Amino acid sequence: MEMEKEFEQIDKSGSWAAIYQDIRHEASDFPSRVAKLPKNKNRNRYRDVSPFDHSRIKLHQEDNDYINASLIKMEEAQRSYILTQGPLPNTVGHFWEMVWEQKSRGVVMLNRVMEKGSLKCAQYWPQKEEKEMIFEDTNLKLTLISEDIKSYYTVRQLELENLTTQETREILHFHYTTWPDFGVPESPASFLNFLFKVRESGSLSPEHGPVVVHCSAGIGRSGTFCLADTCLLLMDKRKDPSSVDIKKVLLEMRKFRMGLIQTADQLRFSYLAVIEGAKFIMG
């Protein structure tokens, strides 16, 4: 099935919390053995959220190459994303070796450091220009260059330098600050605006390495962000833009990281944002 009409042959009844259900049953299941090793227990935020052995991102530190991060590769769309969990206090270093190793240009963050009275991730970048950050047993230096605070999001220019070779690189930080603590945004307009800023930056482009995207666990908000982006790009590309099937895309993405799209409400919100963005992509 025009996915807008399936937005109403579901909201109608309310089989939202049953479509999501079929998605869970039909999703892929591959091995996550590296992630379950006892020596990597402290590298994982949750024990039920792990990357697959076949698509995990490996780090060059031969000592231990493990990080909770996955490469999502979309063939038709010509798009690649790294989805990861928000860094822990002890994996801050590992997060930046990854970014460097992969040649990524942008980091996309979909949560606040603190939500619901608990920490969603470590403070992994500097809040002040004159106070730069260093990482233990990492050989990197990160400096805040500028920052631009707007209503629903903030964009930061950062510098990352290899201390052993003195090589420097520009990283842009795209931080969506207003996702509500519970539920989803009523309106998808500010989220669509955000996406489009990230696109405009050129961060999603093949000249550079894949964008790094995270939230807390790196599967819920993070999955909304990639699914939407891919589905809208696909609309630009096909002859007939109404042939795009979102479960189909979403099921394809779950071959690479488990659990993408955490709730029924997130699913809904995804269908809701694509339908909306499709009105533009046809300007």
Ligand SMILES: CN(C)c1ccncc1
């Ligand atoms: C594995 N995990 C939740 C943590 C590790 C180190 N510090 C805080 C949390």
